[PDB]
A paper describes a structure:
In PIC-4, the last state represented by these PICs, the fMet-tRNAfMet is completely accommodated in the P site in a closed 30S conformation, and the CTD is moved to position 2. The ASL in PIC-4 is further tilted 12° toward the body compared to PIC-3 and hence would clash with the CTD in either position 1 or position 1′, which explains the need for a distinct position 2. In the structure with a second tRNA-accommodated CTD location (PIC-4), the CTD is observed far away from P site with minimal overlap with either position 1 or 1′. The CTD now sits lower on h44 (1407–1408 and 1485–1487) and makes more contacts with h45 (1515–1517) and h24 (783–785). In PIC-4, the CTD is moved further away from ASL to position 2, and the two domains of IF3 are furthest apart in this conformation. In the fully accommodated state in PIC-4, the 30S head closes in to narrow the P site and thus the tRNA is positioned very close to body as well as tilted toward it. In PIC-4, the equivalent complex without IF2, no density is observed for IF1. The absence of IF1 in PIC-4 may be due to h44—an important part of the IF1 binding site—adopting a conformation unfavorable for IF1 once the CTD moves to position 2.
In bacterial translational initiation, three initiation factors (IFs 1–3) enable the selection of initiator tRNA and the start codon in the P site of the 30S ribosomal subunit. IF1 is a small protein that binds in the 30S A site. IF3 is a two-domain protein that plays a particularly important role in the fidelity of selection of tRNAfMet and correct start codon. Here, we present 11 structures of Thermus thermophilus 30S PIC at resolutions as high as 3.6 Å, representing distinct steps during initiation.
Residue numbers in the entry:
A (entry chain G): 2 to 156
B (entry chain X): 3 to 78, 83 to 170
C (entry chain K): 11 to 129
D (entry chain R): 16 to 88
The structure:
Amino acid sequence: ARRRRAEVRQLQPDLVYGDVLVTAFINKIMRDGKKNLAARIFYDACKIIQEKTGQEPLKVFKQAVENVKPRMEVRSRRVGGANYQVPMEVSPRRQQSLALRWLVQAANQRPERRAAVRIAHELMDAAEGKGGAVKKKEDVERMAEANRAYAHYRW
Amino acid sequence: KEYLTNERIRAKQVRVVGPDGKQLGIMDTREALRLAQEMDLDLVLVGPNADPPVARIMDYSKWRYEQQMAEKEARKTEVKSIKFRVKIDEHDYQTKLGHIKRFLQEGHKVKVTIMFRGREVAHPELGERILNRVTEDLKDLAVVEMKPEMLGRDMNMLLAPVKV
Amino acid sequence: KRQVASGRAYIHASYNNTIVTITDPDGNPITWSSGGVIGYKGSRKGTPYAAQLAALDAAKKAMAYGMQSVDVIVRGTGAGREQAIRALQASGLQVKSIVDDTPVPHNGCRPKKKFRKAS
Amino acid sequence: PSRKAKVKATLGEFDLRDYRNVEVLKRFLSETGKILPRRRTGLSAKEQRILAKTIKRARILGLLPFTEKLVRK
RNA sequence: CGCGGGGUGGAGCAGCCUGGUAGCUCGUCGGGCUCAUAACCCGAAGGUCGUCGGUUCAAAUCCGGCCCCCGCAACCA
RNA sequence: AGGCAAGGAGGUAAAAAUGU
RNA sequence: GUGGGAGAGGGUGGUGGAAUUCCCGGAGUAGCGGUGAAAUGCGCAGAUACCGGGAGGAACGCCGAUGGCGAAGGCAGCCACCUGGUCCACCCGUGACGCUGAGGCGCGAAAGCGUGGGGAGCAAACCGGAUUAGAUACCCGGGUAGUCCACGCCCUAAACGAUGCGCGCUAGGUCUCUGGGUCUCCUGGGGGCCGAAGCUAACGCGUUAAGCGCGCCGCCUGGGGAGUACGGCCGCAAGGCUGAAACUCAAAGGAAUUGACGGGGGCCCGCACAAGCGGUGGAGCAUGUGGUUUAAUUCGAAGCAACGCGAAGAACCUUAC
Ligand SMILES: [Mg+2]
Ligand SMILES: [Mg+2]
Ligand SMILES: [Mg+2]
Ligand SMILES: [Mg+2]
Ligand SMILES: [Mg+2]
Ligand SMILES: [Mg+2]
Ligand SMILES: [Mg+2]
Ligand SMILES: [Mg+2]
Ligand SMILES: [Mg+2]
Ligand SMILES: [Mg+2]
Ligand SMILES: [Mg+2]
Ligand SMILES: [Mg+2]
Ligand SMILES: [Mg+2]
Ligand SMILES: [Mg+2]
Ligand SMILES: [Mg+2]
Ligand SMILES: [Mg+2]
Ligand SMILES: [Mg+2]
Ligand SMILES: [Mg+2]
Ligand SMILES: [Mg+2]
């Protein structure tokens, strides 16, 4: 953490397509190291997506991710005893990760029944431009824009 | 501190208490809302978890503001000490007296201490002579709650304003 | 309401706020904008972005008087003086020049201890 | 670190004390109505001081500017 | 005897006043922090509003008695 | 366009009592 | 003496702009001010910001220096006048007229006080606001005295180079200011820095000595007690100058060194924080402890580094109670 820029792990991409993003999403979904459960979940979600909005869910997923991707957000730095929501950029990979996380959160905030289903719905919402994850992203952006005042307190 | 304003109510059928305190009954939510809109002042739910959702039909924001103002006024009232010594400089004494008077005018208590060492000979006597004199000087502003009581190494008084 | 198209802009910059005054070529100020003009009450009131916003607002107001031919006079040292200038440059206004009229005493009367302690 | 010109050297021989010779003293002010330093002028210390005095005198008359506002910065 | 005003969790204070809506600080308990104590932060507990009672759909609130506290007018003291 | 340097900014460097 | 120089040296009489503040005039609108955040504050009677003019009073930006000057306090716009000191060249006059200095007399910042004037800013006290446990503080808003003048006093100071003055001596180098020269280098007088010898407790000083001397005057002889008391003198007062002792302690001290330390600096590091995931604290229960009971609840372990620890196996045993 101190010395080097700390390398970002390259994964085996998806075995069903050839997508690292997909793999990452699956991992995020996966709690407890139950991948061959969350992988199954992911594919169920994909199938559901296909059933509804009849595009290859991979592309849909990508679109959703793009929609949630934030570009400026807020960190927290204390200055003169006051704590500031410091509005700075989000780095590409990091931003992507954040988006993924948000999607997962939304899936588990949703009141609908089953694992795949919720995720699928969330993805569809993201694609549309609505839902929970997208809303969160928007809020984050606003927090940057409500507090664009402090910008100059860059890291 | 903070209640559900006009449309923030899904609490079904409401206890229609105006800003006046008058009961219009157990109206719908919607009916009550309409009434509020017409009357200009919001159906604020001061007891949603009650025998009818206590729909107090005042402007919520306005009410809040009023409360805030009241609170602010309440602050501005407090205890102000003037600690003499046994040996007194007369100018100093006068200044202290003036300060006390000012405090009383403002609305603020004046706890009037002395500082005693040991030497407790005519120390208490001296304190009495001081504090009582001070009281005599500003009876118009404050009258004494606590007389010049011995604190062992102080002599405490409390001059409390005449009217509130 | 009475118009001009040409004149000036005094950027008064304090640390506590940066205010942009927009005047004619005489010295009759038509259109001013402050920190509290852009809501920002308190600290932010004087921060760069706030200053910039104020400047932008002022520019917009001026444009409601056909005003393009604006000279810009930076008065005083403040955080937003450069940002304000930048905003003005961006805006879409005919900036004549970026003249700097800092009000510096030729050894005037003793300043407040604070701005002092300068010796 | 400062090597571009010397206002002494860019100039020819003249009377410093001549204050009414105002066109020529204008070189020894900056773009602002300010005196150029020993380090920018490059006169003798004595010489520099004399020049400064002359400038002040000129300003007092009204021939030279007392102050300016820095342009386009 | 008169008149005035007061009475709220353990202590000081808001509310009455506008009939529905009990806060604030100090303390008490417990925890956190800390090496440790103070301070600090977090919770928790704790008031039926002197009372008899009335109101009223409902009162700390409106009314009175009685209890008091407070100042003054007041004789023996 | 980059190289630094000298200057001028302005931002940041919060607070936080004690001891067998 | 003659000739020449530098200079914020001192005084007296003027003036010049920037700035601020205050008012008149405009033009214009919802805040400005302020801060680590804020709050009092001012503002719709219209501020703040901006232009124009006026009224002031103070203080002199840039030059500006590490610079110059004075004996020291000190001294900065510019000009004029009055004038002090000083340096140099010539070596011309004078011939030992010199050096110091108890006392004396004079100066002497800042504050202070007296009297009169003025008063824009700042600003003790003081009134506010915050901050805080408290805030008589640091922070902010005002605000009187005072800063400014004249005249009088007062005379202290880290009045410091913490280094009395004079002269002679004893390597240089460097940068500077200033004067003369036959001027890429000489020779005087200042101001700094680095170093020969030497000194010094080291630090450092080191031709501007704290080196070698000589002259003289001031003062010291442990720290507190104490610049106090007492007396005396001075002062309108505030105070100052002069200046003890009793008692007390066996130290007070300086300079360095080694560390440790710091809400000092820089360079670094650790799951130290951040980023992320998952927990404990909430619930029950499992334990270990603290505490409290008890006939005994055996003892040990104490912040990290005690607390699912000695116990890797308490029904009796173990077991110490
Ligand atoms: Mg001569
Ligand atoms: Mg006006
Ligand atoms: Mg000298
Ligand atoms: Mg001769
Ligand atoms: Mg002599
Ligand atoms: Mg003498
Ligand atoms: Mg007087
Ligand atoms: Mg002030
Ligand atoms: Mg306070
Ligand atoms: Mg105070
Ligand atoms: Mg102040
Ligand atoms: Mg005076
Ligand atoms: Mg001395
Ligand atoms: Mg020399
Ligand atoms: Mg040396
Ligand atoms: Mg010695
Ligand atoms: Mg003394
Ligand atoms: Mg030492
Ligand atoms: Mg973390």
